[PDB]
Amino acid sequence: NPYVFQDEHFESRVKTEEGRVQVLENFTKRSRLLSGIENFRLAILEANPHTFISPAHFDAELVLFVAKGRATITMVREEKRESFNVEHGDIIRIPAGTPVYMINRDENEKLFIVKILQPVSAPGHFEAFYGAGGEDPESFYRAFSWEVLEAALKVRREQLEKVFGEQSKGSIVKASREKIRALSSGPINLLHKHPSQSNQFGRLYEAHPDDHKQLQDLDLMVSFANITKGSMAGPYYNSRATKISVVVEGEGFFEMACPHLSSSQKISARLRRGVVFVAPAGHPVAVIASQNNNLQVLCFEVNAHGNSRFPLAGKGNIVNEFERDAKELAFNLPSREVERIFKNQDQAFFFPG
Amino acid sequence: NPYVFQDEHFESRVKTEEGRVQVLENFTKRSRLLSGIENFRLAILEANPHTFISPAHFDAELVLFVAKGRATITMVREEKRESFNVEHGDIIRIPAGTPVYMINRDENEKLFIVKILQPVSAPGHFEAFYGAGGEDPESFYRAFSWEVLEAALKVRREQLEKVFGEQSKGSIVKASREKIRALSQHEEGPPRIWPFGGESSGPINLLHKHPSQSNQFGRLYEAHPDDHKQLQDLDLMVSFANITKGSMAGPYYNSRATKISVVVEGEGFFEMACPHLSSSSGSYQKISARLRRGVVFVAPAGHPVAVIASQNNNLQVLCFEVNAHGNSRFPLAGKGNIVNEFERDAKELAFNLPSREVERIFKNQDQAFFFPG
Amino acid sequence: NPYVFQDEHFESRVKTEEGRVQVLENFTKRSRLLSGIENFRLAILEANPHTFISPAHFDAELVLFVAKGRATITMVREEKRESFNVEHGDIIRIPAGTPVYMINRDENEKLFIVKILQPVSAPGHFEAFYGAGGEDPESFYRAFSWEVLEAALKVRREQLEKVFGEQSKGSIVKASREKIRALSSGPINLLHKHPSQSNQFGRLYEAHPDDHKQLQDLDLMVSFANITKGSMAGPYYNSRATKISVVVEGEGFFEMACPHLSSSSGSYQKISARLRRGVVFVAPAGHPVAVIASQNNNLQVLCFEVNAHGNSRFPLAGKGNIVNEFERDAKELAFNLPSREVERIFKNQDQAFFFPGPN
């Protein structure tokens, strides 16, 4: 299944006692079917309570989502140093090239953040540039000769070897109880918002780039779905956007029709927590949750401007909107004999499975 | 010829006794020379009179042009079905994912439509998503299992196996004379001024507007994305040229537009100057090709191109010009040609001849754009 | 070195005994590393005094910079014709497909022009279309049959062969005192701008697309850096722009921290090369780069910075050092050292952007 990514497709770039960062492989590596989203990479960051994430700037425009816990994200722009207080559900865009560090405020629960990066310059490949540490993460300063650093900073050579040539703990280190306290057009909370879809079978929260200028620069919509146990997300497809969905918590399963994979096309997966599945534009996809627990899934909708969700099944079903004569010629069956199939349901988007 | 595509370069994705849909191959497959229009695909739909095209949606932005016959195009859009009655020379913009169906409201004239597609995901590749059908066409509901479809629309399993197992004639099926009359009775859309321009959404009457270039030897109708809501999203200009028999569209080149020309009706030939391939700069290679109905030739930006019509009958070419904003159409011969505007002393040094030998070369054609052949 | 291009990477498309045009190869030819500037090409034009450059148009957007000499650029866009006299440090935008010829109106100085081209059709490739020429500047009219040219131009076949076959001297030809006749929005004199950064150790001129419209179409900033002898342009990185630097005059060297050529889990390869007149080096987005001038003479660098909108010059040393802005707590856990010890190494440089460096 080219449209499904489990744990074996990730690659840990950061691994410490107090934290880890997993980076998903390029979507154009396995198959060319995902020729789009080639300039998009997916990253997952988790950290222990009262820990510190070393500062670094990226070769990519960064948009992240706070999956669990609370945190303090500090961005360093031109002169101005912005610090923002975020919570579970907040969305922040980090502009490419700016330095950013963050901590885990909370005392007992962890901290999970889902990053999506659009590489500038070379597409599909991004790197983190570390300005601190000489062994644990080498400072790019160490890539310069000593004469250049001595001349630029006007500092003794042995003092440079001392400041950089220390720190071997992690790009995610632990913090003192006091240092966490001192550090604690802005962030956008997706959960604390009027749901675009509201019913007992599911709660859908989405932030479209027309509403918030933070997401307009990348033309990317972030949407979150809380599925009721046993319920399902009815079969539908996006007009123009390609859905990159990541499971935050829970189990279920999804199915999708792909005319590219057939013999002139059954595509499905089990869908557990920590699995990424890509739903391209125009592909009919349906998500069903197990009867035991919920299915909280985060979706990234690339190319969101002009998108229009078409439900294959529901109140606004795209088929029962046809003319009475067109339904007859299509199925080669009388009108009322096929008019009843799409008129039976009354719910919206979310259904029970 | 790297710029000429004939019948062997088309794929018949739809094959029915009442019509066919030939889809052109990707411009990259043969060579990387046409890499500028890699994310574009071509299609040609033919249909017998009084027929029905099954509803479907595409993973690509679609802009179709009616090159022969009349039809009724209906789109469902966002909770508001709209239908349009279009005839010869109408441009229709179908948003990506928007389902669409159409008929051939004529009694004896077959349909003939040219489609240009712009994929929104994987570049250069697209597929049609038929929602209704069993075998031909195949509905994507059959990819979902019976257990999921059961709890989707409150319908039993054995009741679904009867609906999705009936249609098998094809995507272009015959229709009774009243079903054609029902759809073609009323067109659904907000009031618009006529002829339909680009100030509001809906079809565009390309042949109902004054030509940008017009004389005895030919006429050129065009729709630029700058003043067209339907085309501005694509930065694609649609042009049509009715070259008189024995006449020619004189040598010219686009400043930044890449022309994807499709011959609708007539016979002729075209010549183009290409420095990119030239057998290693030995000399310009005379890229000539015979032109008939069904031949598609592409002229990349900056390339001088001339289209000559046969002496027998006119040559009528449909032009898809990608990257149209800021595009200037520079003529190399005739009235207002570009080489004439050079300073006199610059022509003496460029050609290495005195002014008496070169000046009246670009000053001795009273006509503009269209000339005798 | 994937980021450095010597004279062996250029290909001369024009070569006459009065001038030549060396065209840099594709940035994506050797490796897929410089994919961010795949749709950009570089070219250098040198011309003897009192010479003429044959007219032509390109299937590419053209932004040229005059590095040395006097000249005048003549363009013929929509019907009307414009002719601008340009000198040292002028920026001229040329729309794709608009013909352009020029001359070196100086009587002694050679005309040196640095071109950057953005192909408007097939990415990474372009060609020059000569209309008024003969054999060596081969006119594209020769690609059409004489029956077509005769009907469209209304000119006899014998005269067409006589005109489109005479010229064989090349694209750059000497012109004898007809210069005065061929020289009698708009250019941007970069050197006549106030430097964005200026001290004793260097001056930085720049023309951002947000302030000039002409560049706004390419999202391309043109920058110049006159670094004093022995001095250096301190380690910095562009937030978004990919810099394509060309050494106009002088000697020196540059260093860059590239984590893509690391060949390790999370390292930074040391990219370095000597700088001399004609060397082109590319500093991708986010890459810390430092340029150092030779101790004898100055080092003058012209920079084409693709993707300039929203770009910021983050300096890693000097007055506006980015690391100094960090909070004292953040400085400690990052270095695993006391906050008081790490501050001394980033506050010890008083100068901005330009510093000395001799060892």
Ligand SMILES: [Cu+2]
């Ligand atoms: Cu597919």
Ligand SMILES: [Cu+2]
């Ligand atoms: Cu060519």
Ligand SMILES: [Cu+2]
């Ligand atoms: Cu690198």
